[PDB]
């Protein structure tokens, strides 16, 4: 359930994914650049190519089902939530400076297994914002969640294993 396949800037960091409407330029989402690779959720760009500084970035791998997508190389993020510690989300809200928020993840209980989840409701356009643990390592991204019957929004902590190294 996935797809494989001038070079743009890849300076490590948190990014805003921009686009233009017939009436203005705006933020569609966000992502994180790590080890020369840009990571974000599939639904922010739908696998389209992106400009980064002077160069272009083409998608390397992406999975609709997993809602994950990376550019300029294989998925480099490999840190996961340990189900205990509190985490922090680097909120990339459109038209606002980046701010971190701390929270104790809840959990998405799925037939497959359990997935960390945060009950944070931020404006539309924050999909792709990274979530980091104590050591400042990205353990996942925000944006793919559910709208609860009580008006609550819960987002999964979307993460994937490192594609470069073996599993075992």
């Amino acid at each position: 359930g996935g797809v494989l396949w001038k070079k743009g800037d890849t300076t490590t960091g948190v990014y805003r994914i921009m686009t233009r409407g017939l009436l203005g330029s705006y933020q569609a989402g966000a992502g994180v650049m790590v080890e020369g690779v840009f990571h974000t959720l599939w639904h922010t760009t739908k696998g389209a190519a992106l400009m980064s500084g002077e160069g272009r970035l083409d998608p390397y791998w992406g999975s609709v089902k997993e809602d994950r997508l990376c550019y300029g190389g294989p998925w480099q993020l490999q840190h996961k939530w340990n189900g205990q510690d509190e985490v922090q989300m680097i909120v990339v809200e459109p038209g606002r400076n980046v701010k971190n928020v701390q929270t104790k993840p809840g959990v998405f209980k799925t037939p497959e297994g359990e997935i960390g989840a945060v009950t944070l409701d931020f404006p539309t356009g924050t999909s792709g914002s990274p979530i980091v643990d104590k050591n400042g390592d990205v353990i996942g991204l925000y944006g793919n969640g559910v709208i609860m019957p009580n008006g609550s929004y819960i987002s999964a902590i979307v993460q994937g294993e490192r594609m470069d190294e073996p599993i075992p």
Binding site: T12, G13, V14, I90, Q102, G106, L120
Partner: protein, 41 residues
């Protein structure tokens, strides 16, 4: 060309003075083939 671009906006860091909020309830969900989460599992 493309219709989207990216712009670095910050460093990847933890902020000791970050505000704390949100709850941590457990919810039963299913992940459909569209990559979307469904309630009630």
């Amino acid at each position: 060309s493309t219709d989207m671009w990216i712009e670095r906006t910050a460093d990847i860091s933890w902020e000791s003075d970050a505000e704390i909020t949100g709850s941590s309830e457990r919810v039963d969900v299913r992940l459909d083939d569209d990559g979307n989460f469904q309630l009630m599992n």
